[PDB]
Design a protein around this ligand. Structure first.
Ligand SMILES: *C(=O)c1cc2cc(C(N)=O)ccn2c1N[C@@H](C(=O)O)[C@](C)(COC(N)=O)S(=O)O
Length: 244
């Protein structure tokens, strides 16, 4: 009973309130819907930043570079945040967006196997360059918000070219919110070492009836901008649309 015009205007205002430019792609079945205050972003390329961890984890686990219970030990060197200065599993590192662990995993996989695997799943522009430990943070790997929802959709439905158990292992690392019967599985991302900076929140809502609705929020981040606006805007948009 709410007009399409009202939905579009409501979601535009969430991005306007946050004083940024962004888009949120929602996918229902085969149909893509683009909301926000910068709809042209939808098919533009950005570095994936931490959202690459989802694929890093799939690759590492398929190729036996790690197990889900293995503990990556803090080497005792100072890390960007105190929370990263501890021993953690892949799942814990995913929740904390703990790059040092994912760089270690990237190094275990190695450049040649990484380039091969990123080409095989056909992720973004598929170019990882020559540095195995930062291609997802500063380039050359780039991906569009549309490609990100499609990846989220593939993962949520076990359609990626990986074992079913690999995909289940990673999906289980991604639960970030329960909203009475609805479960939100997503990975956030913030590319700080690039201009302009890019923010991501990519995932899907699993509803009580078992239906899965993939999304990808993509916006421009500034200095002094808080990381949880990505979440605030996403939840507000999913709720506005009655998805949660
Ligand atoms: C993830 O994109 C991310 C990578 C890095 C890398 C560095 C570095 N010094 O090399 C610093 C910060 N990074 C990231 N962002 C996280 C962060 O805490 O800075 C991020 C804000 C994580 O917060 C959550 N939700 O875990 S982001 O959303 O990944």
């Amino acid at each position: 009973h709410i007009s399409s015009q009202q939905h579009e205007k409501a979601i535009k205002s969430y991005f306007d309130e946050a004083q940024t430019q962004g888009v949120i792609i929602i996918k229902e079945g085969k149909n893509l819907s683009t909301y926000g205050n910068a709809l042209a972003r939808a098919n533009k390329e950005y570095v994936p930043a931490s959202t690459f961890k989802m694929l890093n984890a799939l690759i590492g686990l398929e190729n036996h570079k790690a197990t889900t219970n293995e503990i990556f030990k803090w080497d005792g060197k100072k890390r960007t945040y105190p929370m990263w200065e501890k021993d953690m599993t892949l799942g814990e590192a995913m929740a904390l967006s703990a790059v040092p662990v994912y760089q270690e995993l990237a190094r275990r996989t190695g450049l040649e196997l990484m380039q091969k695997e990123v080409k095989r799943v056909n992720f973004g522009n598929t170019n990882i360059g020559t540095q195995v430990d930062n291609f997802w943070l500063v380039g050359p790997l780039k991906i569009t918000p549309v490609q990100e929802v499609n990846f989220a959709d593939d993962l949520a439905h076990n359609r990626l070219p990986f074992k079913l158990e690999t995909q289940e292992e990673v999906k289980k690392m991604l639960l970030i919110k329960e909203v009475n019967g609805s479960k939100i599985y997503a990975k956030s991302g913030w590319g700080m070492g690039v201009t302009p900076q890019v923010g991501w929140l990519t995932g899907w809502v699993e509803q009580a009836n078992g239906k899965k609705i993939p999304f990808s929020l993509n916006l421009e981040m500034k200095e002094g901008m808080s990381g949880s606006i990505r979440n605030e805007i996403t939840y507000k948009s999913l709720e506005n649309l009655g998805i949660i």
